[model samples]
Target: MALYGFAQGLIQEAGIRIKQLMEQNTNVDKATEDFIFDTILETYPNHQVLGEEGHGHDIDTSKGTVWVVDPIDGTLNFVHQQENFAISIGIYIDGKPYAGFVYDVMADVLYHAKVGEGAYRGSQPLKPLNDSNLRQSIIGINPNWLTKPILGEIFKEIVNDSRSARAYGSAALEIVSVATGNLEAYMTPRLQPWDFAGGLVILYEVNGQASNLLGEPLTISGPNSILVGNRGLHQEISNDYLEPHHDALIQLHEQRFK
Candidate 1:
């Protein structure tokens, strides 16, 4: 409980620093990142931290606690709109999830969870997702996936089959949308660990699922392709859409990138 409180306090303070920097109309992303990194290092000297800003400990991830952070989640949105951006933090113990938090900086709303405790949006505890099918589901999907050479038509077809699709530039918030039942699923071909770390814990607490494109459990150390959704929708999409085209997608990605 103390650890959770400390984390929540740290994020709130970081949020204050971010708002101050933004009010000055200065370079926000780097400034926010630096402030957050310094604060974390000073406050928790022993715990390892991996921050998007690139300032943290490089301790063995399998041994002790690691704090994964994204100081400013939607940099483009932060620069242009000042909304839709967030601060994401995921705390892991011995390579397993412990707790997670994602703060919507502008709205002052937070989505947070611990391994066993339920997820929370602000002060309200979230409920588990109701079972849903693809046709009745709304998904968070980047529009670029529809036209990009790597993902292309398969993603577009998924969008066509769903009840609707949306693209929120911030991955943390998009994943939180699934936890909150705002979206039935959120899929992306690539995401860094920090992008989904906090949301993964929250989603898990709410009986949601986060996994690789092939339906494997996500890793905490590197970039991965991900499918985050309610349990029913996750299985449905994985088996029906992703499995059928897994090989083709892999080939397309390798051929295009290589």
Candidate 2:
């Protein structure tokens, strides 16, 4: 509890510092990145760090303990609109996330979770996913959902099932929404470990289902794209997405991108 509390305080402090720094009209992205980089250096001297801001000492993920940090998860959004950006961090012990945190500095909301402990929004305990119908369910997805094969076909499979889907331009927030049951599921073409780490803890606590778009378990240490949602809703989406297109996924990536 103490460690968790400390983590929460640290994140909240960072958030406030970020917001203040952002107000300066001084490259908020660079300011926020530098601030987090320096703060993490002071606080966790020995820990390895990975950040989206590209302002930290690079370290291998296979090392002892790594702090996957995204100073600003939605850089594009942060640059254009100050509203949806977030600070994401995942503490990995030998590549496995022991704890994770996603803080929306502008909104003053923090989503933190420990492997076995549970997940929280600020101080409120987050709840598990409720049974939702295809038509009524809300989904959180990236723009990749609208593109070609792989995620594109997967998303196309369920475009009509939900009341509507939303893309917040922030991967961390998308996953947290699933964890909090606000959105039944979240899908992304590919996400780095730092982006989805904290939200997985929340999803697990709530019994929300998460697997790569392939329906395989997500290895914390291994990087991959994500597809996470509630059980019933997840099942429905997977059939339309993963079931019919598993082989096509590998082929598409190998054929087109590679």
Candidate 3:
């Protein structure tokens, strides 16, 4: 349990730092990144860290403990609105998830989870998700994605079919919304592990599903086209909306890593 507690504490501290720094906002992203990197180094020097600012160990993250971090999830949101941005962190042991956190710094809310222990918002446990009907569900999608090629038409149709769609511009918080039951699902063409790492863990604890547009499992190694939703929402979206665009999805996924 110490492992989980320590990991959780690190994120809380780092997130609090972001909140404070926003009032005195360098490269606030870099500042928060370095702060968390330093803390991890002091406590778990041997653990590998994969941070968005590229201020972490370069060793293969698959073999040992790895902490993936995104200091400020929505940079534009922080600069423009000073809201909706968050600090995201995820810990893995030998490439498998262990603990995760996504803190909405401005909201003073922390969403967290430990593998098999369940997920929570603040001190309250999150409820398991029920299947949502696409026609009546609200989705959190990236606005930029709607204009992109290959998969643009795919998501455009989804937006039309859904009751409504939202674009929060913060992948971490968007995923958090799924776990919190605020949105039925969230999707984007590309996101780093640091982006989806923490949020995916919390979502999984609440019986949510995470995958690529092609319905493939996401990996911690690098960037992925993320699609997250509650049990039925993910299946239905993947089968009904994504499957028909198989050619586009495969092309998009392949070109992403290339």
Candidate 4:
């Protein structure tokens, strides 16, 4: 509980600092990332930090407490619109998620949760996801998936079948949207651990699923393909739409990109 409280306080503090930097209009993401990383290390030198900006050290995440951070989850949004970006932090204990937070900087809204505890958007507790089928659901997805090489055509089918589709350009906020029941599912072919780590904890508390396209658990040590949604929808989407081309997509992605 103490650690959770500290994390919450730290996130709030970092959010405030970030907004201040935004007002200055002269700071970059690296500056804010460095600020947060330095603050965490100064407060808890023993804790390991896995940061997007590469904080001068690398450490294993499976052993002790690991802080996975994306100081600014939507850099383009932050730089262009000055909105839609967020600060994401996921705390893991011995390779398991403990607590997570995704703070919408401009709106000052926070979605957070600890393992086994229910998720909350600001002061309101998020409700469990209600059941819904593809035709009645709104999916959050990048439109480019419809025109890409391997998975493009596959996602086009999902888009055409679903009620509608939307893209927010920020993985953290998109996951929060799913937790809040705004988006039925959010799928992306590539995302770093920091991109989905914090949202995964909150989503879990709200009965949402977070995994790779193959339904494997996410590892904070690297990048992964994200498929997140409510239980039934996740299963159906994976089995019906995604599974058929899952292996092919994986192989193609590795061959072309890796």
Number of clashing pairs per prediction, in order: 0, 0, 0, 0
Candidate 2 stretches greater than 4 Å from native = 1-5, 55-62, 149-151, 220-222, 255-258
Write down the RMSD of all candidates, one decimal each: 2.0, 2.7, 1.4, 1.6
- What are the lDDT figures for the candidates, one per model? 0.86, 0.74, 0.88, 0.87
Ordered by lDDT, highest first, the candidates read 3, 4, 1, 2
Name the top lDDT candidate.
3
The reply for model 4, stretches above 4 Å from the true place, is 56-58
Q: How many backbone clashes does candidate 2 have?
A: 0
lDDT of 3 by residue, 1-258 (tens): 887888778878887777676566347888888988898889888988898888554668798899999999999998889899889999999999999899998888999999899999989999999998899899998777888876788888899989999988799999999999999988888888899999989999999999988888997887888889987889889999999989878877778889
lDDT of 2 by residue, 1-258 (tens): 654565677777778878776675436656666766676668677766776666333466767767677778888888789779888877778766678899988888888888887888978998877767677887786566587645575577577677888888998888888888778877876777778877777778778888877677875454676778888877877776467877777665455434
Candidate 4 has its poorest 10 consecutive residues by lDDT at 20-29
TM-score of candidate 3 against the unseen true structure = 0.95
What's the CA error at residue 149 for candidate 2, in Å? 5.6
1 versus 4: better lDDT goes to: 4
- In candidate 1, which residue pairs clash? none
Q: Candidate 1 versus the native: TM-score?
A: 0.94
Of 2 and 4, the candidate ranking higher by lDDT: 4
